[PDB]
Design a protein around this ligand. Structure first.
Ligand SMILES: O=C(O)c1ccc2c(c1)nc(Nc1cccc(Cl)c1)c1ccncc12
Ligand SMILES: [Cl-]
Ligand SMILES: [Cl-]
Length: 328
């Protein structure tokens, strides 16, 4: 019976065409205008290349979509359309097809990013505040647009640390939020899955993304990446419970009438809730402050309803130094 505290009805207040992505008819341009220069990587249903638009010499990336996944292609395309111009959202430049095979591809702006494993060990206190604030702008925007990203993780938060640019990428798992809708829990990377996913609670909302963001914040301020390093989905919840506590987990389950898979009985143990200060030591103390811990404590909560919204997080004192610099 759970619903989002913010933007709950926003899709129902829009035209059906906004959210009815199965009815969306993309305009497919011609991929022949793009020259592929380098393969960047591959996902389950996609492959990304650096490319040049031969008509204007612009560097872009091209994400070729395994064509069988028709509904999921329309979903990602419609979501990106709806997010057009959103702050710190990766810009979709065009939707194209190989004109012979008809295989579809998405063309995005190119971001010259610093890979996160290297970047996160050199961030300053101000840097973390700045980049988290910029990521929150993207999440507040997509949530306000009725969309849950559902795959927030370091790889999907591209950061150009020279130009101070951030983009939230890979909307392939994103979905429209509708009150009382039950969603597939097989979303997000293991380390970024909220407890709701790990306990099979399907009536989740935008607040899933705020758990994932909290995991990223913890990894940055404490220099433990990923912060909750489970070996599988069961162990992931155990790792969370060793920090947030087991009695606190059971109170969450009871509130939402959540059934707990009995395999957990043999592995959860009994764990006190830990103080966040327990994670401080000489290597991270310059990144941790009372305001960072207060914010983190309000994000990494079992109860998805009680987590801060992206807006509430942006309003937190931890970001005041960023707001002050962005106005002065
Ligand atoms: O899916 C998107 O929305 C998406 C959108 C933009 C980028 C992307 C994925 N992946 C990139 N790089 C990358 C690096 C390693 C593996 C893979 Cl598969 C991709 C990349 C690089 C530079 N500029 C934009 C992007
Ligand atoms: Cl779903
Ligand atoms: Cl721990």
């Amino acid at each position: 019976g759970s619903r989002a505290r913010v933007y709950a009805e926003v899709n129902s207040l829009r035209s059906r065409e906004y959210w009815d992505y199965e009815a969306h008819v993309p305009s497919w341009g011609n991929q022949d205008d793009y020259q592929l220069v380098r393969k960047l990587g591959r996902g389950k249903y996609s492959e990304v290349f650096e490319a040049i638009n031969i008509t204007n010499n612009e560097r872009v990336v091209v994400k070729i979509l395994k064509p069988v996944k028709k509904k999921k292609i329309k979903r990602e395309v419609k979501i990106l359309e709806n997010l057009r111009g959103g702050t710190n959202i990766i810009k979709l430049i065009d939707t194209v097809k190989d004109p012979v095979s008809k295989t579809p591809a998405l063309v995005f702006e190119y971001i010259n990013n610093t890979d996160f494993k290297q970047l996160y060990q050199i961030l300053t206190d101000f840097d973390i505040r700045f980049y988290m604030y910029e990521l929150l702008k993207a999440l507040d925007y997509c949530h306000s647009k009725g969309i849950m990203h559902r795959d927030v993780k370091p790889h999907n938060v591209m950061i150009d640390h020279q130009q101070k640019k951030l983009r939230l990428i890979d909307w392939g798992l994103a979905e429209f939020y509708h009150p009382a809708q039950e969603y597939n829990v097989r979303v997000a990377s293991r380390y970024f899955k909220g407890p709701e996913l790990l306990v099979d609670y399907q009536m989740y909302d935008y607040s899933l993304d705020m758990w994932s963001l909290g995991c990223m914040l913890a990894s940055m301020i404490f220099r433990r990446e990923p912060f909750f390093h489970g070996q599988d989905n069961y162990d992931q919840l155990v790792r969370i419970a060793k920090v947030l506590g087991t009695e606190e987990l059971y109170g969450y389950l009871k509130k939402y009438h959540i059934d707990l898979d009995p395999h957990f009985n043999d592995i959860l143990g009994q764990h006190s809730r830990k103080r966040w200060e327990n994670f401080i030591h000489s290597e991270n103390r310059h990144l941790v402050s009372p305001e960072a811990l207060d914010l983190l404590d309000k994000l990494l909560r079992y109860d998805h309803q009680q987590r801060l919204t992206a807006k509430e997080a942006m309003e937190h004192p931890y970001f005041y130094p960023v707001v002050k610099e962005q106005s002065q």
